Every structure is written in C-alpha cells, then in structure tokens.
Design a protein around this motif. Structure first.
Motif, PDB file in Angstrom:
ATOM      1  N   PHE E   1       0.863  -1.213   0.000  1.00 34.48           N
ATOM      2  CA  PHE E   1       0.000   0.000   0.000  1.00 34.48           C
ATOM      3  C   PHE E   1       0.881   1.238   0.000  1.00 34.48           C
ATOM      4  CE2 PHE E   1      -3.535  -2.630   0.228  1.00 34.48           C
ATOM      5  CZ  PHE E   1      -3.558  -3.425   1.359  1.00 34.48           C
ATOM      6  N   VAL E   2       0.291   2.383  -0.313  1.00 36.41           N
ATOM      7  CA  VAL E   2       1.022   3.635  -0.415  1.00 36.41           C
ATOM      8  C   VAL E   2       0.430   4.622   0.584  1.00 36.41           C
ATOM      9  CG1 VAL E   2       1.687   3.327  -2.838  1.00 36.41           C
ATOM     10  CG2 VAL E   2      -0.499   4.462  -2.272  1.00 36.41           C
ATOM     11  N   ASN E   3       1.191   5.653   0.922  1.00 33.32           N
ATOM     12  CA  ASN E   3       0.668   6.714   1.757  1.00 33.32           C
ATOM     13  C   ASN E   3      -0.343   7.567   0.991  1.00 33.32           C
ATOM     14  OD1 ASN E   3       2.095   6.192   4.252  1.00 33.32           O
ATOM     15  ND2 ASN E   3       3.961   6.898   3.220  1.00 33.32           N
ATOM     16  N   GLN E   4      -1.223   8.214   1.746  1.00 33.88           N
ATOM     17  CA  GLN E   4      -2.411   8.892   1.254  1.00 33.88           C
ATOM     18  C   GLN E   4      -2.445  10.325   1.714  1.00 33.88           C
ATOM     19  OE1 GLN E   4      -3.335   5.210   0.025  1.00 33.88           O
ATOM     20  NE2 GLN E   4      -4.669   6.961  -0.353  1.00 33.88           N
ATOM     21  N   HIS E   5      -2.971  11.200   0.866  1.00 32.34           N
ATOM     22  CA  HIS E   5      -3.318  12.558   1.244  1.00 32.34           C
ATOM     23  C   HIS E   5      -4.830  12.642   1.083  1.00 32.34           C
ATOM     24  CE1 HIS E   5      -2.891  17.148   0.295  1.00 32.34           C
ATOM     25  NE2 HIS E   5      -3.218  16.930   1.556  1.00 32.34           N
ATOM     26  N   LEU E   6      -5.549  12.722   2.204  1.00 32.57           N
ATOM     27  CA  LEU E   6      -7.007  12.567   2.219  1.00 32.57           C
ATOM     28  C   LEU E   6      -7.661  13.676   3.012  1.00 32.57           C
ATOM     29  CD1 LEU E   6      -6.940   8.767   3.075  1.00 32.57           C
ATOM     30  CD2 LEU E   6      -7.709   9.712   0.886  1.00 32.57           C
ATOM     31  N   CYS E   7      -8.500  14.476   2.352  1.00 38.21           N
ATOM     32  CA  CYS E   7      -9.222  15.563   2.991  1.00 38.21           C
ATOM     33  C   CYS E   7     -10.721  15.375   2.833  1.00 38.21           C
ATOM     34  CB  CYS E   7      -8.817  16.909   2.378  1.00 38.21           C
ATOM     35  SG  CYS E   7      -7.092  17.388   2.630  1.00 38.21           S
ATOM     36  N   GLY E   8     -11.489  15.945   3.751  1.00 36.37           N
ATOM     37  CA  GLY E   8     -12.939  16.003   3.595  1.00 36.37           C
ATOM     38  C   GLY E   8     -13.562  14.630   3.464  1.00 36.37           C
ATOM     39  N   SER E   9     -14.497  14.510   2.529  1.00 38.65           N
ATOM     40  CA  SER E   9     -15.227  13.272   2.340  1.00 38.65           C
ATOM     41  C   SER E   9     -14.331  12.134   1.849  1.00 38.65           C
ATOM     42  CB  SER E   9     -16.388  13.482   1.385  1.00 38.65           C
ATOM     43  OG  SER E   9     -15.919  13.918   0.122  1.00 38.65           O
ATOM     44  N   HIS E  10     -13.205  12.458   1.228  1.00 41.41           N
ATOM     45  CA  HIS E  10     -12.291  11.418   0.749  1.00 41.41           C
ATOM     46  C   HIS E  10     -11.736  10.565   1.877  1.00 41.41           C
ATOM     47  CE1 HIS E  10     -12.575  13.066  -3.229  1.00 41.41           C
ATOM     48  NE2 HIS E  10     -12.295  14.264  -2.746  1.00 41.41           N
ATOM     49  N   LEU E  11     -11.537  11.170   3.043  1.00 38.18           N
ATOM     50  CA  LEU E  11     -11.104  10.406   4.203  1.00 38.18           C
ATOM     51  C   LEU E  11     -12.156   9.389   4.622  1.00 38.18           C
ATOM     52  CD1 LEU E  11     -11.267  10.216   7.599  1.00 38.18           C
ATOM     53  CD2 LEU E  11      -9.108   9.683   6.391  1.00 38.18           C
ATOM     54  N   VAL E  12     -13.422   9.797   4.641  1.00 37.59           N
ATOM     55  CA  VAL E  12     -14.490   8.892   5.030  1.00 37.59           C
ATOM     56  C   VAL E  12     -14.640   7.726   4.039  1.00 37.59           C
ATOM     57  CG1 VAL E  12     -15.657  10.701   6.375  1.00 37.59           C
ATOM     58  CG2 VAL E  12     -16.497  10.182   4.073  1.00 37.59           C
ATOM     59  N   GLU E  13     -14.471   7.994   2.744  1.00 39.78           N
ATOM     60  CA  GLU E  13     -14.457   6.941   1.728  1.00 39.78           C
ATOM     61  C   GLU E  13     -13.341   5.938   2.004  1.00 39.78           C
ATOM     62  OE1 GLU E  13     -16.302   6.279  -1.016  1.00 39.78           O
ATOM     63  OE2 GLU E  13     -17.576   8.040  -1.112  1.00 39.78           O
ATOM     64  N   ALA E  14     -12.172   6.436   2.399  1.00 40.44           N
ATOM     65  CA  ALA E  14     -11.049   5.563   2.732  1.00 40.44           C
ATOM     66  C   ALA E  14     -11.326   4.704   3.964  1.00 40.44           C
ATOM     67  CB  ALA E  14      -9.766   6.363   2.907  1.00 40.44           C
ATOM     68  N   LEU E  15     -11.871   5.309   5.018  1.00 44.57           N
ATOM     69  CA  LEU E  15     -12.246   4.553   6.210  1.00 44.57           C
ATOM     70  C   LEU E  15     -13.260   3.460   5.877  1.00 44.57           C
ATOM     71  CD1 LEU E  15     -12.351   7.369   8.857  1.00 44.57           C
ATOM     72  CD2 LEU E  15     -10.909   5.351   8.952  1.00 44.57           C
TER      73      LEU E  15
END
Ligand code: ZN
Lengths: 21, 30, 30, 21, 30, 21
Positions: E1-15
C-alpha cells in the motif's frame, strides 16, 4: 451565487434547499 | 445540521442528497 | 463538452466515465 | 503527464480519451 | 500500500474501504 | 488527530485501520 459561496466560504443545507425544484 | 465547505463535484453530491426526488438546478457563475 | 480541472480521485472518476467498458490506465508522474 | 496537467491546469475529455484501452 | 493525502469526504471513503463490515468512528478535531 | 494528519500531511492505511470498530 450558491456554487461560489459554498466553496469560497461556507453554506448551510437550508441555503442549498433553495435550489431544489 | 452543520455548515458545509463544498467545492466542485462535492456540491452536486450535496444537492442530490438534500433535494432527492425533487431534483435541482446547478447554476455556477461564469 | 467543457474543460475540466480534475485532481486526485476525481480524475479517476472522469476516466471511468469517458472510457467505460474500454477500461483505462492511470499513470501519475513519480 | 495527463494526471498532472488536469490538476495543475485544465484538460479536456478528448485528452482523457487517449488513456482508454 | 502507499501513503495517502485525504481531505474532507475522501477520508471517510477511505475509512469505509479499510474497515468494511467492522465500521468505524470519524472523529475530527473541533 | 487522524482527520487532520491525513489532510495536512499524509497518512497510511495502517494508521486508518486504528479507527475501525
Ligand atoms: Zn474532492
């Protein structure tokens, strides 16, 4: 307008509801 | 509900959720 | 069609829509 | 490349189509 | 896996994707 | 916290997994 306000500032769901048909 | 900071496609997703079967108009400034 | 400003996952969503069943390659610079 | 251009500038759907298989 | 830059709703999609049926808590700083 | 770190910096999927139930 609303598109700009929500992005440059903040907006409420009640403001958005005015754009429903 | 809470206030929102919504840009780009995220605004349209929000309109879809708020308006549901009513539908909506998306009208950006040009 | 109109020109697009697409970052992050939004670009991949656009490729998915444009390409459909053709599929696509996502190739960022590293 | 395309990923960078679409994000730092703008790009068209016709440019994107070149990345379809 | 790779590191992520996640803001706003994109973080919730990742979770949602990482946690699946486990579910998750979303807890921003206020 | 995690919400802020992922957005201001970067975060891993392994860090995110700590927020699963
Ligand atoms: Zn986004």
């Amino acid at each position: 307008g609303i598109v700009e306000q929500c992005c440059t500032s903040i907006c409420s769901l009640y403001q958005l509801e005015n754009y429903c048909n | 509900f809470v206030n929102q900071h919504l840009c780009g496609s995220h605004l349209v997703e929000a309109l879809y959720l708020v308006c549901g079967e009513r539908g909506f108009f998306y009208t950006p400034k040009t």
